[PDB]
DNA sequence: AAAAAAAAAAAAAAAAAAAAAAAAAAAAAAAAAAAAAAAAAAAAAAAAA
């Protein structure tokens, strides 16, 4: 009588792999299109 | 004519309620601190008197 239980767990898993893909899309929107902010030639003297 | 018995009475005792007092709690302030946000002074880079 675990039919309900397991199929319902798969139904959460099925609607939630959608959430995983949604997070991947959130990344794609958030993917940088940019790099690490550069140095100012004085932070060069400071840290380097 | 008098005694005893019987009946209609005040004083004391018991219980509850309303006045007041102190402490505690909800609240409802005017004042300060911390964090956040909007400008500013020495150093650095490129083309040119």
Automatic annotation (TrEMBL):
Protein name: AAA family ATPase
Native source organism of the sequence: Vibrio cholerae
Lineage, highest ranks first: Bacteria, Pseudomonadati, Pseudomonadota, Gammaproteobacteria, Vibrionales
Range of the intact protein held here: 2 to 49 of 405
């Amino acid at each position: 009588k675990r039919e309900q239980t397991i199929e319902n767990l798969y139904q959460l898993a099925q609607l939630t792999q959608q959430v995983q893909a949604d997070r991947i899309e959130i990344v794609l929107e958030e993917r940088r299109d940019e790099h690490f902010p550069p140095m100012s030639k004085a932070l060069m003297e400071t840290r380097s």
